[PDB]
Amino acid sequence: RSGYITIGYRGSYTKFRRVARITVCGKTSLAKEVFGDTLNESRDPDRPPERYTSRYYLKFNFLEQAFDKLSESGFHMVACSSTGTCDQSEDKIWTSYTEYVFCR
């Protein structure tokens, strides 16, 4: 059952790490396996297993809780990529997207 899964979050803050939502991306067969009811299939609820997707997210807001579920379902962190750069009258906003790669 060799495969990959990639998760990421969008951080926007005016201070600890605050994670708005965890996006889970990969093949939908593996995505259902590693995580349980937590996934919110709302955006992509009809994808047949063995067809790839990118539109799921996690009902919980804890990044390492998602990390742990994959390391205890046989995944390991292979790569990471951060892309961050940046409307009020005084201060501005800061968007931040980072990615997390999980293998086999």
Partner: protein, 333 residues
Amino acid sequence: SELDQLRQEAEQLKNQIRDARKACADATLSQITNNIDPVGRIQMRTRRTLRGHLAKIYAMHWGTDSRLLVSASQDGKLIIWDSYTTNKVHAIPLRSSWVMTCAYAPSGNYVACGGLDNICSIYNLKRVSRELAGHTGYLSCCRFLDDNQIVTSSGDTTCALWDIETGQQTTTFTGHTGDVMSLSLAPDTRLFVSGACDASAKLWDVREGMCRQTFTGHESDINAICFFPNGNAFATGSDDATCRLFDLRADQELMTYSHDNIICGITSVSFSKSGRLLLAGYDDFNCNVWDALKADRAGVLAGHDNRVSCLGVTDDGMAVATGSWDSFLKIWN
């Protein structure tokens, strides 16, 4: 070894409280209210738009007559509004343009404000009257008990009860480990609850100046707190996108108010007169109307282009007032 003994007792006591709270929960609030007919869809509309603030509005407080209200903006000005005619009753220039809160005395003779100046300023409505100093942190919130007493919260992790006549702190409230963002008085003004950056809310005794109960379960800072009308419960807004109703006698969290696609902190919370509706200002520019018993969204108020910074509900429950960083105030009905 001496520090570990006192710690292990604290851990056991925390676990002991954990088991007592679980034994008290036989059922949930959602189960007992399932047969109650939902509120449905109650439509509101902008009945008043208050203009004349030149910067971000950081706070609002209604009057006891359900007409007058005060607002605190980051331009350095306090404006008392007549909500019926939209007439400006008073415009008071502030010595520091950084102001995080305002309060309206129940008698209507005085109004207070404060902010990063670490000062609670009492304004006489019948020029500055009192400047209450001694807080080592910024002043996040304040509420009048009467004209002679006011309760404040600060970024120094401590609240305080003030004697306005003398200008000195009467009773200091300690035990918060983080910045205290908000407070709300009980109906009888004997007790008050406070939200803070330690992700906990605390019920305080005003007379005895000690913490009675401590409520937890929030995953981030609590920026807003409001008492349920009967004084037996309170709701907390937080940066974790959820509103949580706590009950005093049950000494635990009754219900969590949250919805997918709203991933933003709650700046302010206020109940309706009957307490069936819980209103929460959000960072997503909206104001969501929650069913207190059913935990469902009964409506939404979007009149603002920036986040709603403060809310208020009149004692008669006739109108809902919102305020935001877009410099406008809106009275909803």
